[PDB]
Nucleic acid binder design. Structure first.
Ligand SMILES: Nc1ncnc2c1ncn2[C@@H]1O[C@H](CSCC[C@H](N)C(=O)O)[C@@H](O)[C@H]1O
Ligand SMILES: Nc1ncnc2c1ncn2[C@@H]1O[C@H](CSCC[C@H](N)C(=O)O)[C@@H](O)[C@H]1O
Lengths: 284, 183, 284, 188
DNA sequence: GAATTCGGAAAAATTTTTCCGAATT
DNA sequence: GAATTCGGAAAAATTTTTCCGAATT
């Protein structure tokens, strides 16, 4: 019949990128339930979205009954913590221990919220994680979600390297990534006034400050007034494609804002992936 | 809850058992018959590359069973691995909502799961476990099989510290109200 | 007959409130020479005003020839450091020592920039400082500027107490301070979403974080989600009347931004003082 | 601080001087600039300037010389040493002739080693010139800023300063004042 | 009256850097 | 085959809290 607003379950929501991208595409959001544990992340989603996100705390306390009452859901998205799967951490604990084993919570709740076989209604889902991960882990995640991932590197639509895997059933996930007119594709596009970018594309940004200085010998990315400098948080926000000051919340400083941004999604990549949904739910 | 089947309608159970083989333990109670060398039990030990179409072809199944490696055998696999994998293929084996028939599953732990592992198990298998003791050894069982006493965890804690088909068998016997009773 | 843009010498410029208030009133600014030594303040003025401010560093190195070359000037404003004059500092060194004596630099350069007899051209100036200051210091400052100050408390147009002295020759400085329509007069008006103000007006904000917690028993000003909290930097910006994120610059955190804001001017008070200037210079 | 043409001898007049903090009244007559017959004396001496307005300086009539000095080294000062500087600058500007009537007009400020070096660059920034260091040889010294057309290294004075702590030497000042002879009357 | 305040030197917290590190690309 | 990376425990800075404190409203 007619278009209805989208109802979203979002696990490991971070700074509510899922909501922001849907809103930026013009999709009416009817319900957005977010599971998230970091108090500063929750402040970002709360304040920047005027209380429209319904927070539900630790993913591991969402019950089978919770999915039924909070649902139905049209979109189930999540990107689990990659601190125990990424190659960066020598103390990685793998897929089955530490925080790696949080993926199975997404697998678990995806299955609770999936419609039954008699229901032909539209249902979409996506799971994101890093590429820098053991082959056995990449295999087992594709075993549980029952499909293979797309690899999209944010470098095609942003000023930063960021190779990520995306599993799911959205329309056109394998299609080519072409940049848009408003995409800040080079570091200079992101920088504030009176600052000079040394490089056009920066290396993958992590939660640490070392990722900002480039290469094997840790060079500063920016020149200002003759001296070298690191990136500012507004500049990080632009590289990721967030609105500037999106993380100017909760008295957070340089390190806290970089941690939130360092672990998030590239907004332009997510917009590309969610864009086919405009034709299934109500628009504004 | 499943209604019980009159004795003339009961059929030989088809069981999928993972990690462990309960083949000739389950015949000892009459659920399988000796002569089906292509028996009604399918045994797999490395599930990591098995697809749903694999389970569907070996199906249908009426019982799905899995267990942790025996306490002592220093495993080459994380203890939760046997849980999450059991969970994955159990969902491939379930009857469709369109055709409800008696269908049971069992998972048992040899005290090879620690308590954060145990809270995952009870969340995924949707119930607390039952602690069945021997008086010294013990196992924990999750299952939807209707079953027929008190121990605190510090005995098991200290037993596990220090370093079993007998206890798993009995609970298999309410399944006699659903399948053929051979021997 | 016809007006030209205003030419401004601003000493101890801080975060360029002078320029911002002029821009907000619609006055064409032709030249704005700023003397300022704090690298983060300069970053704010630079960035937020796109290089329109001509920075010239330490006030004590501006020469008689500099004033001739950089001039003529139509407006000479300044608020010198009140850390050796305020009552808060027991180790205050007074008007003639420490940073107190920076006032005389303003006196000195004010007279360099003043037109000579026979020049009937408009010339305006203003000097701001704290009330919490010894009477002998208040007397001598009025001895050197040859006039007595008006006292304007920001509490009439903002959510904070902020009593300061203003010396100068602008039109209507002794007139009544009446609040404007857009003035955020209560703390609730300034706060972010999902936050509750305990009070309506907060005590004078200084560069220290103790000034945020209210009264003699140091109460938190805000309640969020049931728990008590201090003010966020966007909220401080709003109390002072700066645009939000005005100081989201140079990777500064909570402490740095409060220092810049704690020592600055209250924008609404300043606008009121500069507003009579619209009829002497070009408008936009 | 200006350069002035010199005045023929018959046109010279008795100087009018304003002297602050220290009085050169009975020293400036020794060079013939004042006479002991005057009711006004042509010299105005004030010592607590803090409540002095411009029109006070204007009412005290016109001035040709304006002099101020720091108190003597051996004097426990009740005033911050820079106060005598800023205050002298404050009233000197009240005393200058208007740009519309340029006439010979001179000013002097001298320091008794009572200003330290951060105070010294305030002095030279405000009085628009470096000082001249005038020594006493058999040990004392003063530094003079002035627009009047009139070698020791600083550790000599540095160490001189520190021992001396334990009055005003007019002897050093006076001579600087001479050239003004070319501008005003020279009383016998 | 006692409440207030364009701060600061120590002291106790949080914080931002040295090396770290290896499988996957 | 040399470079890359949704990180972390120690270690060295930096920072954010205790008392501090008094003349002026
Ligand atoms: N047990 C748990 N339940 C819910 N969220 C959790 C969790 N453990 C970790 N998380 C959160 O999972 C997130 C992983 S990073 C994901 C960030 C997100 N993709 C974004 O766009 O910002 C982190 O925010 C972390 O705080
Ligand atoms: N010698 C000097 N020359 C120029 N500025 C100086 C200085 N010494 C201190 N300052 C600056 O003087 C300012 C005093 S606070 C002035 C704040 C300003 N009126 C505003 O609206 O923000 C501070 O910014 C301080 O950095």
């Amino acid at each position: 019949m007619r278009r209805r607003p989208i109802r979203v379950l979002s696990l490991f929501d971070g700074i509510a990128t899922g909501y922001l991208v849907l809103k930026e595409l013009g999709i009416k959001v009817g319900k957005y339930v977010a599971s998230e544990v970091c108090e500063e992340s929750i402040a970002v989603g709360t304040v920047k979205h005027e209380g429209n996100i319904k927070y539900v705390n630790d993913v591991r306390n969402i019950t089978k009954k919770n999915i039924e009452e909070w649902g139905p859901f049209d979109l189930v998205i999540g990107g689990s913590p990659c601190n125990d799967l990424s190659n960066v951490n020598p103390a990685r604990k793998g897929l089955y221990e530490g925080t790696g084993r949080l993926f199975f919570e997404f697998y678990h709740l995806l299955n609770y919220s999936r419609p039954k076989e008699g229901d032909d209604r539209p249902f979409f889902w996506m799971f994101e994680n890093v590429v820098a991960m053991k082959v056995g882990d990449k295999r087992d995640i594709s075993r549980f979600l029952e499909c293979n991932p797309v690899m999209i590197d944010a470098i095609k639509v942003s000023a930063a390297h960021r190779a990520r895997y995306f599993w799911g059933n959205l329309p056109g996930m394998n299609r080519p990534v072409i940049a848009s007119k408003n995409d800040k594709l080079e570091l200079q596009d992101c920088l504030e006034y009176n600052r000079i970018a040394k490089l056009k594309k920066v290396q993958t940004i992590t939660t640490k400050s070392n990722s900002i200085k480039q290469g094997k010998n840790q060079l500063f990315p920016v020149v200002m007034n003759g001296k070298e400098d690191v990136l500012w948080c507004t500049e990080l926000e632009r590289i990721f494609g967030f609105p500037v000051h999106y993380t100017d919340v909760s008295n957070m400083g340089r390190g806290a804002r970089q941690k939130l941004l360092g672990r998030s999604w590239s907004v332009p990549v997510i917009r590309h992936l969610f864009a086919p949904l405009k034709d299934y739910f109500a628009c504004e | 809850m499943f209604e019980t089947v009159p004795v003339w309608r009961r059929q030989p159970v088809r069981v999928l058992s993972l990690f462990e083989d309960i083949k000739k333990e389950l015949t000892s109670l009459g659920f399988l018959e000796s002569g089906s060398d292509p028996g009604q039990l399918k045994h797999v030990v490395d599930v990591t590359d098995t697809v749903r179409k694999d389970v569907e072809e070996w199906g249908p199944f009426d019982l799905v069973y899995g267990a942790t490696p025996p306490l002592g055998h220093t495993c080459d696999r994380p203890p939760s691995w046997y849980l999450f994998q059991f969970h994955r293929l159990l969902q491939y084996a379930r009857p469709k909502p369109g055709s409800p028939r008696p269908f049971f599953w069992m998972f048992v732990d040899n005290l090879v799961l620690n308590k954060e592992d145990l809270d995952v198990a009870s969340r995924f298998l949707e119930m607390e476990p039952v602690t069945i003791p021997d008086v010294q050894n013990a196992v924990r069982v999750w299952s939807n099989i209707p079953a027929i006493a008190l121990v605190s965890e510090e005995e098991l804690s200290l037993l596990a510290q220090n370093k079993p088909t007998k206890l798993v068998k009995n609970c298999f016997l309410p399944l006699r109200e659903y399948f053929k009773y051979f021997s």
